[PDB]
Amino acid sequence: VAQLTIGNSTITTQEAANIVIAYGEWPEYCSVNRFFTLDTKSWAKDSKGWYWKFPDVLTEVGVFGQNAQFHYLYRSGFCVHVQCNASKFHQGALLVAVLPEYVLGTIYATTQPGQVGAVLTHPYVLDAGIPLSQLTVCPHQWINLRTNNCATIIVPYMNTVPFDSALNHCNFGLLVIPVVPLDFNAGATSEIPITVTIAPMCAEFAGLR
Amino acid sequence: NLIETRCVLNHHSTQETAIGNFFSRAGLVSIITMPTDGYVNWDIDLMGYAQLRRKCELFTYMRFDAEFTFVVAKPNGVLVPQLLQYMYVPPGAPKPTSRDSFAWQTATNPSVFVKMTDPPAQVSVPFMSPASAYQWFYDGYPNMMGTFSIRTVGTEKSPHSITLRVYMRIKHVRAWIPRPLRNQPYLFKTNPNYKGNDIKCTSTSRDKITTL
Amino acid sequence: NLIETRCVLNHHSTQETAIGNFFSRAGLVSIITMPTDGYVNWDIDLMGYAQLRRKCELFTYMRFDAEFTFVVAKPNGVLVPQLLQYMYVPPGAPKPTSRDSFAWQTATNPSVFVKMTDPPAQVSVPFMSPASAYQWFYDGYPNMMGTFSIRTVGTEKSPHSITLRVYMRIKHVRAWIPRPLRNQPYLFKTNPNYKGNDIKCTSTSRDKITTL
Amino acid sequence: GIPTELKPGTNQFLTTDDGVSAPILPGFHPTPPIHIPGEVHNLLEICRVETILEVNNLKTNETTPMQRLCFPVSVQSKTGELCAAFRADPGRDGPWQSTILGQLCRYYTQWSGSLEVTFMFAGSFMATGKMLIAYTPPGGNVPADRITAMLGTHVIWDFGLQSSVTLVVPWISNTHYYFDYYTTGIITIWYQTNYVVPIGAPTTAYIVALAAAQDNFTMKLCKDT
Amino acid sequence: GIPTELKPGTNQFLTTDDGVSAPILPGFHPTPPIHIPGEVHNLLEICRVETILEVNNLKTNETTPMQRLCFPVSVQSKTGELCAAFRADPGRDGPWQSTILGQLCRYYTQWSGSLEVTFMFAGSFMATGKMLIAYTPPGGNVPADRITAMLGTHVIWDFGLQSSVTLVVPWISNTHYYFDYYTTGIITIWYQTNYVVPIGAPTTAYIVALAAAQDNFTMKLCKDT
Amino acid sequence: GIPTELKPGTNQFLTTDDGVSAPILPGFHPTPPIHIPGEVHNLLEICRV
């Protein structure tokens, strides 16, 4: 169990050499770098899934939120960390994957949910017409409550242009879907928390205020 | 239908699954009829047919040239000595609004002048995007390649019915960032909307999990 | 109409604004009709159309070759087995006065004999000036490139209507001494006369100097 | 005046002719490419990732389709009995249609190579037991009970120690024509022991099945579906 | 008897085909060129000269169009107030149509690069004062008063010392399609101080605005206007 | 613009012409051959039994 410290933000995460780098590329260049810890989501027995859009999740949070609203161009990688807190008497399995240019479909507030994130209505088709069974062709990681309670993906910058605006285009989406549903016996803690921690890597801004 | 016989034992070449050979052949993209206004506008679309829309949406970014062929005849086979014009309007240029517009003699819109008794015309269109790749999926809020305008050359209407079909080959293909394949029926050509009332399961079913 | 999105960041090649690429493509310069005298004379003019007159008058001296193409058909598309003759009369040579003049068999006027069912004829004309460059602006008191004479071959009149259009490309371009671009409507093809009763302002107006 | 002849085959349009044609814009310089991560040079790089098998493709799961991705183990089922059975058919219908391997095989005619099937236990940490992952070669018969499935090719996966196991199918082959000339095996899951669970932990668990291709998997003769 | 075939694309006339055709006069030797001064090899050499902006393009100046080339400063206008405002749009309508840069951009589709705007005071020698030449980046809002325009990018041009100042726009860009994808800034002229003038010298003066492109300005995809 | 002429004998189909024609499947790689015993290279090897 190590204790990471970047900036004035400290998290305690066990040292585990099973990170996944998206497509084998590290985020590089062409005080915003710290650990942003989002609000915590409650995993219940009948939950369906959650998603967050990037960099829409950090447009109103911190100095990253005001640097996006003032500067014109924007480019960064990310380091997403999703962890779970459950006992040895709970069971379930999550699939944590990123998906570049994740465009949703009607059967806006749903497309840009913000810091909280939105919930999936039909998680079998990912609310986009593509099946959940082939989501693992994306950079993914399994959270199996039997064995591990942690997942971390390093995402570089993926775009057709070297710089882009941060207030309309959303680069990718982070999907957390309970493939195997949560189960326990009566008397245990009914809702299990899921915590997302984001840290920007190699962030650049080129447009004036 | 299942036959136990004839197992092959040698591995094949990996060049059948290269990204060039997956899109290598030319397929029909449009059928344009002009019966007896006098002009047709067809802006270039790849997502018009359900085939090759599911094949291009396997990836997120694609970058390629194009090669168009114009097989033109009468509505039943016939070929008459008629002169035709295929004008290519680039992205950002105005389209013709009528049969005798001034855009038909605009020098910066390149035209092809063929006869109907000729072999079909062939035209190569380069990579026309201001970005570095085309993208079928854009998450933000606001892929044009041009327009083909087709008419019969003259100042008075011709006494013939024209029916041409356009074949397109895709050259020098590069693809990025694979993606799950669409398993729901398409609704519109712009957005990935699906019918949420009924969801088709990806696999067909069986009676029991043990009955193989 | 104004959208804030999609700034491009890479510079482009400077070869799009070279003086060869500014005039590189072929455009229509004349449409010649010959309904059922029997001959048409068209002396070569670049200032006939308002486009490419404003583009050649950006400079003072220009020096180039030419390449003419003769797309010929019936008034509505059709093509009949008809033999045609395109005679090029050089500067300083007499023109034909009728359909059976002796200048049609003059050996020093080069002719092209095509059929209407052929691909269009192509002819390259060199730099024909006694000076070292053409000049669109001459301040003194007294640019000919020739004449194209077009007829149907025969001793009796043909029972067909001929309509051809001439396309011209400009090759090996050199330009000298740039000049302001014309912002007034043209009146005549010879002199830069403008309508002095009403003068069009170069820019369109706004309400106040502060209301952007 | 070079003397040439025209052979049979002029003025024809062959739709798979690989020729060089005239550019519509010769003076146009297109946008130079930049480095975008995740370039795919071959379709076999997408066939070598694990994707979820839909083994639980029953007719009663069609209204709740999220249950098709996990099949249960339980405490009231006796030892020595069968849990699941499915044949290893990527191109054919059934459980392999939900994989990315079974969808790229619909774009081709023949394929041959080896696969690997990965299982993953998703029960509580306090539970333990044993399963038998048997594989029958093609041409053989499905096993009737656990004692004859043991004599073939099998692994003994106890999930009190390992949360995941991998079984490798050695060779499959297809030559499609309607009918197909298809040599495929059968994978069966047998209860070696019962499901052992203490007080407070749940009595029903689930297994997810993942499937991919190997490095010697190839396919040929592209075909439209 | 060399065996040849005819591909699709014979007997077609492509208007941008760059071929070699037969000369109409093979025995003709044209006039050899001499040295004429002022040769233009590229159209970007004409885009890099200062030309007069028509900032004073009001509706009342249409009858006397010579007043559109100069906008006034005066003595009765208070300090801290706005004098002129215009956005930096070469291709679009407005003040940039009178420049040679805004007319050569009508012959193309996309362009990107930096500009430079030059101002020039044309008042009497005995007059003095200060102006504030502010520039807003694209996407930002126009300043409401002089104190917020000072916090951006600005120069302080006092015309008692320098008769001319130069402001550089760092980047503009267009991709025309109707609508255009257009990232442009806004230039505003603020009265820093009032107009100081002695007895005998005139109370109203004028400024001329000049504009050109930089060395990194390019454009592409030639288009007819 | 290479000046060529067409001799007598164009657009004819001679049934014993040994030419090279366009492949219907350019991207197709056929099955490589193996060693089968009993190869006949000439018909006179069957006349000598």
PDB file of C-alpha atoms in Angstrom, chain C:
ATOM      1  CA  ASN C   1     -23.294  31.331 -40.684  1.00  0.00           C
ATOM      2  CA  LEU C   2     -20.278  32.093 -38.454  1.00  0.00           C
ATOM      3  CA  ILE C   3     -19.256  28.992 -36.482  1.00  0.00           C
ATOM      4  CA  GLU C   4     -16.523  29.221 -33.842  1.00  0.00           C
ATOM      5  CA  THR C   5     -15.488  25.573 -34.196  1.00  0.00           C
ATOM      6  CA  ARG C   6     -12.790  23.784 -36.267  1.00  0.00           C
ATOM      7  CA  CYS C   7      -9.665  25.920 -36.365  1.00  0.00           C
ATOM      8  CA  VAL C   8      -6.967  24.428 -38.566  1.00  0.00           C
ATOM      9  CA  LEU C   9      -3.429  24.750 -37.264  1.00  0.00           C
ATOM     10  CA  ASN C  10      -1.041  23.493 -39.970  1.00  0.00           C
ATOM     11  CA  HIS C  11       0.161  25.736 -42.766  1.00  0.00           C
ATOM     12  CA  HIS C  12      -0.528  24.717 -46.353  1.00  0.00           C
ATOM     13  CA  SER C  13       1.741  24.439 -49.356  1.00  0.00           C
ATOM     14  CA  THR C  14       2.550  27.631 -51.248  1.00  0.00           C
ATOM     15  CA  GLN C  15       2.036  25.873 -54.597  1.00  0.00           C
ATOM     16  CA  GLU C  16      -1.706  26.606 -54.601  1.00  0.00           C
ATOM     17  CA  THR C  17      -0.995  30.309 -55.196  1.00  0.00           C
ATOM     18  CA  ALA C  18       1.679  29.925 -57.853  1.00  0.00           C
ATOM     19  CA  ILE C  19       1.128  31.880 -61.038  1.00  0.00           C
ATOM     20  CA  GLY C  20       0.723  28.694 -63.066  1.00  0.00           C
ATOM     21  CA  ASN C  21      -1.894  27.205 -60.759  1.00  0.00           C
ATOM     22  CA  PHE C  22      -3.937  30.422 -60.749  1.00  0.00           C
ATOM     23  CA  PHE C  23      -4.731  29.932 -64.463  1.00  0.00           C
ATOM     24  CA  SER C  24      -4.183  26.191 -64.715  1.00  0.00           C
ATOM     25  CA  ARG C  25      -7.634  24.881 -65.606  1.00  0.00           C
ATOM     26  CA  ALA C  26      -9.632  25.109 -68.831  1.00  0.00           C
ATOM     27  CA  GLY C  27     -12.792  27.189 -69.029  1.00  0.00           C
ATOM     28  CA  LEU C  28     -15.433  27.931 -71.620  1.00  0.00           C
ATOM     29  CA  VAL C  29     -14.699  30.981 -73.762  1.00  0.00           C
ATOM     30  CA  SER C  30     -17.267  30.830 -76.591  1.00  0.00           C
ATOM     31  CA  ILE C  31     -20.458  29.079 -77.661  1.00  0.00           C
ATOM     32  CA  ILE C  32     -20.825  28.948 -81.442  1.00  0.00           C
ATOM     33  CA  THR C  33     -24.135  28.093 -83.096  1.00  0.00           C
ATOM     34  CA  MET C  34     -24.548  27.283 -86.782  1.00  0.00           C
ATOM     35  CA  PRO C  35     -28.229  26.679 -87.612  1.00  0.00           C
ATOM     36  CA  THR C  36     -29.682  25.115 -90.745  1.00  0.00           C
ATOM     37  CA  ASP C  37     -24.455  31.344 -94.174  1.00  0.00           C
ATOM     38  CA  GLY C  38     -22.812  28.062 -93.314  1.00  0.00           C
ATOM     39  CA  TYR C  39     -19.634  29.347 -91.664  1.00  0.00           C
ATOM     40  CA  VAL C  40     -18.736  31.135 -88.432  1.00  0.00           C
ATOM     41  CA  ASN C  41     -15.730  33.340 -87.689  1.00  0.00           C
ATOM     42  CA  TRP C  42     -14.618  33.591 -84.056  1.00  0.00           C
ATOM     43  CA  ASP C  43     -11.496  35.650 -83.436  1.00  0.00           C
ATOM     44  CA  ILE C  44      -9.759  34.749 -80.203  1.00  0.00           C
ATOM     45  CA  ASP C  45     -10.650  36.953 -77.224  1.00  0.00           C
ATOM     46  CA  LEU C  46      -9.989  36.454 -73.531  1.00  0.00           C
ATOM     47  CA  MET C  47     -11.899  39.540 -72.371  1.00  0.00           C
ATOM     48  CA  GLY C  48     -15.226  38.195 -73.648  1.00  0.00           C
ATOM     49  CA  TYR C  49     -16.429  36.880 -70.288  1.00  0.00           C
ATOM     50  CA  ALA C  50     -16.504  38.918 -67.078  1.00  0.00           C
ATOM     51  CA  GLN C  51     -14.742  36.049 -65.370  1.00  0.00           C
ATOM     52  CA  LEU C  52     -11.051  35.773 -66.447  1.00  0.00           C
ATOM     53  CA  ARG C  53     -11.196  39.392 -67.561  1.00  0.00           C
ATOM     54  CA  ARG C  54     -11.012  40.443 -63.915  1.00  0.00           C
ATOM     55  CA  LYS C  55      -8.415  37.708 -63.373  1.00  0.00           C
ATOM     56  CA  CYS C  56      -6.129  38.687 -66.263  1.00  0.00           C
ATOM     57  CA  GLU C  57      -6.388  42.401 -65.437  1.00  0.00           C
ATOM     58  CA  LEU C  58      -4.722  41.823 -62.078  1.00  0.00           C
ATOM     59  CA  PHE C  59      -1.431  42.143 -63.989  1.00  0.00           C
ATOM     60  CA  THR C  60      -0.168  44.427 -66.745  1.00  0.00           C
ATOM     61  CA  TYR C  61       1.891  42.052 -68.917  1.00  0.00           C
ATOM     62  CA  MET C  62       1.195  38.356 -69.479  1.00  0.00           C
ATOM     63  CA  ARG C  63       2.921  35.757 -71.646  1.00  0.00           C
ATOM     64  CA  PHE C  64       1.455  32.316 -72.268  1.00  0.00           C
ATOM     65  CA  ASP C  65       0.610  29.581 -74.749  1.00  0.00           C
ATOM     66  CA  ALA C  66      -2.902  28.282 -75.328  1.00  0.00           C
ATOM     67  CA  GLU C  67      -4.708  24.987 -75.793  1.00  0.00           C
ATOM     68  CA  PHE C  68      -8.137  24.875 -77.406  1.00  0.00           C
ATOM     69  CA  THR C  69     -10.714  22.100 -77.288  1.00  0.00           C
ATOM     70  CA  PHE C  70     -13.807  21.907 -79.480  1.00  0.00           C
ATOM     71  CA  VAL C  71     -16.731  20.076 -77.883  1.00  0.00           C
ATOM     72  CA  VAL C  72     -19.232  19.818 -80.744  1.00  0.00           C
ATOM     73  CA  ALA C  73     -22.739  18.319 -80.769  1.00  0.00           C
ATOM     74  CA  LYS C  74     -26.300  19.021 -81.891  1.00  0.00           C
ATOM     75  CA  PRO C  75     -28.456  21.635 -80.056  1.00  0.00           C
ATOM     76  CA  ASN C  76     -29.733  18.787 -77.846  1.00  0.00           C
ATOM     77  CA  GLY C  77     -26.983  16.296 -77.152  1.00  0.00           C
ATOM     78  CA  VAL C  78     -27.177  14.258 -80.355  1.00  0.00           C
ATOM     79  CA  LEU C  79     -24.223  13.286 -82.513  1.00  0.00           C
ATOM     80  CA  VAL C  80     -24.497  12.526 -86.220  1.00  0.00           C
ATOM     81  CA  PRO C  81     -21.791  11.273 -88.636  1.00  0.00           C
ATOM     82  CA  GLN C  82     -20.791  14.715 -89.917  1.00  0.00           C
ATOM     83  CA  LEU C  83     -17.347  15.875 -91.038  1.00  0.00           C
ATOM     84  CA  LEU C  84     -16.220  19.304 -89.822  1.00  0.00           C
ATOM     85  CA  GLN C  85     -13.304  21.667 -90.415  1.00  0.00           C
ATOM     86  CA  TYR C  86     -11.707  24.077 -87.927  1.00  0.00           C
ATOM     87  CA  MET C  87      -9.365  26.461 -89.740  1.00  0.00           C
ATOM     88  CA  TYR C  88      -7.028  28.674 -87.700  1.00  0.00           C
ATOM     89  CA  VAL C  89      -6.270  31.986 -89.422  1.00  0.00           C
ATOM     90  CA  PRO C  90      -2.999  33.442 -88.035  1.00  0.00           C
ATOM     91  CA  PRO C  91      -2.521  37.176 -87.341  1.00  0.00           C
ATOM     92  CA  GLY C  92      -2.037  39.030 -90.603  1.00  0.00           C
ATOM     93  CA  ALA C  93      -3.837  36.527 -92.855  1.00  0.00           C
ATOM     94  CA  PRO C  94      -7.198  37.127 -94.564  1.00  0.00           C
ATOM     95  CA  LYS C  95     -10.402  35.577 -93.255  1.00  0.00           C
ATOM     96  CA  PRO C  96     -12.992  33.663 -95.312  1.00  0.00           C
ATOM     97  CA  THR C  97     -15.800  35.885 -96.580  1.00  0.00           C
ATOM     98  CA  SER C  98     -18.242  33.153 -97.652  1.00  0.00           C
ATOM     99  CA  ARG C  99     -18.715  29.393 -97.506  1.00  0.00           C
ATOM    100  CA  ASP C 100     -16.805  28.708-100.748  1.00  0.00           C
ATOM    101  CA  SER C 101     -14.036  31.280-100.525  1.00  0.00           C
ATOM    102  CA  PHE C 102     -10.525  30.529-101.730  1.00  0.00           C
ATOM    103  CA  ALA C 103      -9.149  31.033 -98.213  1.00  0.00           C
ATOM    104  CA  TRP C 104     -10.581  27.673 -97.128  1.00  0.00           C
ATOM    105  CA  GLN C 105      -8.001  25.865 -99.285  1.00  0.00           C
ATOM    106  CA  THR C 106      -5.145  28.219 -98.393  1.00  0.00           C
ATOM    107  CA  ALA C 107      -2.255  25.995 -97.326  1.00  0.00           C
ATOM    108  CA  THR C 108      -0.803  28.377 -94.719  1.00  0.00           C
ATOM    109  CA  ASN C 109      -4.000  28.380 -92.638  1.00  0.00           C
ATOM    110  CA  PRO C 110      -3.797  25.078 -90.721  1.00  0.00           C
ATOM    111  CA  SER C 111      -7.028  23.102 -90.538  1.00  0.00           C
ATOM    112  CA  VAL C 112      -8.341  20.262 -88.392  1.00  0.00           C
ATOM    113  CA  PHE C 113     -10.659  17.678 -89.959  1.00  0.00           C
ATOM    114  CA  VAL C 114     -12.717  15.793 -87.370  1.00  0.00           C
ATOM    115  CA  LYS C 115     -15.962  13.858 -87.246  1.00  0.00           C
ATOM    116  CA  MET C 116     -18.755  14.690 -84.835  1.00  0.00           C
ATOM    117  CA  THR C 117     -18.724  11.130 -83.451  1.00  0.00           C
ATOM    118  CA  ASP C 118     -15.087  11.560 -82.374  1.00  0.00           C
ATOM    119  CA  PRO C 119     -13.494  12.744 -79.162  1.00  0.00           C
ATOM    120  CA  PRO C 120     -13.078  16.532 -79.280  1.00  0.00           C
ATOM    121  CA  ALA C 121     -10.188  18.072 -81.171  1.00  0.00           C
ATOM    122  CA  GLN C 122      -7.254  19.575 -79.287  1.00  0.00           C
ATOM    123  CA  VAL C 123      -4.958  22.279 -80.659  1.00  0.00           C
ATOM    124  CA  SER C 124      -2.031  24.132 -79.069  1.00  0.00           C
ATOM    125  CA  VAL C 125      -1.424  27.736 -80.147  1.00  0.00           C
ATOM    126  CA  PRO C 126       1.973  29.298 -79.292  1.00  0.00           C
ATOM    127  CA  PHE C 127       2.848  32.827 -78.171  1.00  0.00           C
ATOM    128  CA  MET C 128       1.846  34.894 -81.202  1.00  0.00           C
ATOM    129  CA  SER C 129       2.856  38.437 -80.340  1.00  0.00           C
ATOM    130  CA  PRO C 130       5.581  40.516 -82.012  1.00  0.00           C
ATOM    131  CA  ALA C 131       6.310  42.046 -78.595  1.00  0.00           C
ATOM    132  CA  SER C 132       7.632  40.051 -75.643  1.00  0.00           C
ATOM    133  CA  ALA C 133       4.327  39.920 -73.734  1.00  0.00           C
ATOM    134  CA  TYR C 134       0.653  40.578 -74.199  1.00  0.00           C
ATOM    135  CA  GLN C 135      -0.661  43.737 -72.591  1.00  0.00           C
ATOM    136  CA  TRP C 136      -4.251  44.380 -71.569  1.00  0.00           C
ATOM    137  CA  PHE C 137      -3.538  48.086 -70.989  1.00  0.00           C
ATOM    138  CA  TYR C 138      -2.007  50.312 -73.665  1.00  0.00           C
ATOM    139  CA  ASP C 139      -1.933  54.031 -72.925  1.00  0.00           C
ATOM    140  CA  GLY C 140      -0.959  55.214 -76.402  1.00  0.00           C
ATOM    141  CA  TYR C 141      -2.813  55.436 -79.702  1.00  0.00           C
ATOM    142  CA  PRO C 142      -2.579  52.850 -82.535  1.00  0.00           C
ATOM    143  CA  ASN C 143      -2.945  41.633 -78.830  1.00  0.00           C
ATOM    144  CA  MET C 144      -4.292  39.674 -81.771  1.00  0.00           C
ATOM    145  CA  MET C 145      -3.900  35.916 -81.481  1.00  0.00           C
ATOM    146  CA  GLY C 146      -5.830  34.720 -84.521  1.00  0.00           C
ATOM    147  CA  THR C 147      -9.228  33.610 -85.760  1.00  0.00           C
ATOM    148  CA  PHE C 148     -10.989  30.243 -85.805  1.00  0.00           C
ATOM    149  CA  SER C 149     -13.206  29.615 -88.830  1.00  0.00           C
ATOM    150  CA  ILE C 150     -15.623  26.691 -88.587  1.00  0.00           C
ATOM    151  CA  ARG C 151     -17.689  25.110 -91.356  1.00  0.00           C
ATOM    152  CA  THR C 152     -19.102  21.798 -92.530  1.00  0.00           C
ATOM    153  CA  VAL C 153     -17.124  20.109 -95.288  1.00  0.00           C
ATOM    154  CA  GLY C 154     -18.952  19.835 -98.590  1.00  0.00           C
ATOM    155  CA  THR C 155     -20.205  21.656-101.646  1.00  0.00           C
ATOM    156  CA  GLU C 156     -23.860  21.680-100.622  1.00  0.00           C
ATOM    157  CA  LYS C 157     -25.475  22.553 -97.299  1.00  0.00           C
ATOM    158  CA  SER C 158     -25.858  19.925 -94.601  1.00  0.00           C
ATOM    159  CA  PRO C 159     -29.261  19.123 -93.021  1.00  0.00           C
ATOM    160  CA  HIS C 160     -28.000  19.458 -89.457  1.00  0.00           C
ATOM    161  CA  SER C 161     -27.708  22.138 -86.795  1.00  0.00           C
ATOM    162  CA  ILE C 162     -24.228  22.478 -85.304  1.00  0.00           C
ATOM    163  CA  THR C 163     -23.555  23.837 -81.820  1.00  0.00           C
ATOM    164  CA  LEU C 164     -20.018  23.785 -80.474  1.00  0.00           C
ATOM    165  CA  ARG C 165     -18.398  25.263 -77.394  1.00  0.00           C
ATOM    166  CA  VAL C 166     -14.715  26.136 -77.110  1.00  0.00           C
ATOM    167  CA  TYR C 167     -12.649  25.398 -74.005  1.00  0.00           C
ATOM    168  CA  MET C 168      -9.273  27.039 -73.503  1.00  0.00           C
ATOM    169  CA  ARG C 169      -6.417  26.233 -71.126  1.00  0.00           C
ATOM    170  CA  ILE C 170      -3.563  28.668 -70.485  1.00  0.00           C
ATOM    171  CA  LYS C 171      -0.067  27.171 -70.300  1.00  0.00           C
ATOM    172  CA  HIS C 172       3.424  28.425 -69.362  1.00  0.00           C
ATOM    173  CA  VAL C 173       2.184  31.590 -67.704  1.00  0.00           C
ATOM    174  CA  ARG C 174       4.423  34.504 -66.756  1.00  0.00           C
ATOM    175  CA  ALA C 175       2.990  37.708 -65.310  1.00  0.00           C
ATOM    176  CA  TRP C 176       4.392  41.153 -64.559  1.00  0.00           C
ATOM    177  CA  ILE C 177       3.489  44.347 -62.672  1.00  0.00           C
ATOM    178  CA  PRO C 178       0.419  43.762 -60.446  1.00  0.00           C
ATOM    179  CA  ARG C 179      -2.497  46.155 -60.486  1.00  0.00           C
ATOM    180  CA  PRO C 180      -5.646  46.880 -58.426  1.00  0.00           C
ATOM    181  CA  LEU C 181      -8.654  44.660 -59.072  1.00  0.00           C
ATOM    182  CA  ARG C 182     -11.683  46.043 -60.903  1.00  0.00           C
ATOM    183  CA  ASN C 183     -14.500  47.005 -58.522  1.00  0.00           C
ATOM    184  CA  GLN C 184     -16.853  48.676 -61.027  1.00  0.00           C
ATOM    185  CA  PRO C 185     -19.124  46.987 -63.592  1.00  0.00           C
ATOM    186  CA  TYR C 186     -17.711  46.668 -67.097  1.00  0.00           C
ATOM    187  CA  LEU C 187     -19.252  48.618 -69.974  1.00  0.00           C
ATOM    188  CA  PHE C 188     -17.298  47.791 -73.145  1.00  0.00           C
ATOM    189  CA  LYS C 189     -14.751  45.122 -74.021  1.00  0.00           C
ATOM    190  CA  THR C 190     -12.078  47.514 -75.273  1.00  0.00           C
ATOM    191  CA  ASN C 191     -11.703  50.402 -72.814  1.00  0.00           C
ATOM    192  CA  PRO C 192     -11.976  50.560 -69.002  1.00  0.00           C
ATOM    193  CA  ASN C 193     -15.028  52.811 -69.083  1.00  0.00           C
ATOM    194  CA  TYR C 194     -17.228  52.906 -65.997  1.00  0.00           C
ATOM    195  CA  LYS C 195     -20.627  54.429 -65.272  1.00  0.00           C
ATOM    196  CA  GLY C 196     -19.853  57.742 -63.593  1.00  0.00           C
ATOM    197  CA  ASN C 197     -23.449  58.463 -62.588  1.00  0.00           C
ATOM    198  CA  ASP C 198     -23.440  55.868 -59.790  1.00  0.00           C
ATOM    199  CA  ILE C 199     -20.289  54.605 -58.075  1.00  0.00           C
ATOM    200  CA  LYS C 200     -20.419  51.329 -56.180  1.00  0.00           C
ATOM    201  CA  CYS C 201     -18.573  51.441 -52.880  1.00  0.00           C
ATOM    202  CA  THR C 202     -15.997  48.688 -52.487  1.00  0.00           C
ATOM    203  CA  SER C 203     -17.352  47.536 -49.131  1.00  0.00           C
ATOM    204  CA  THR C 204     -20.897  47.006 -47.952  1.00  0.00           C
ATOM    205  CA  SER C 205     -22.045  49.267 -45.156  1.00  0.00           C
ATOM    206  CA  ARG C 206     -23.017  49.068 -41.488  1.00  0.00           C
ATOM    207  CA  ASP C 207     -24.990  51.294 -39.129  1.00  0.00           C
ATOM    208  CA  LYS C 208     -22.334  52.670 -36.781  1.00  0.00           C
ATOM    209  CA  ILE C 209     -18.560  52.461 -36.577  1.00  0.00           C
ATOM    210  CA  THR C 210     -18.799  50.828 -33.134  1.00  0.00           C
ATOM    211  CA  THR C 211     -21.514  48.253 -33.935  1.00  0.00           C
ATOM    212  CA  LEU C 212     -19.310  45.388 -35.077  1.00  0.00           C
TER     213      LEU C 212
END
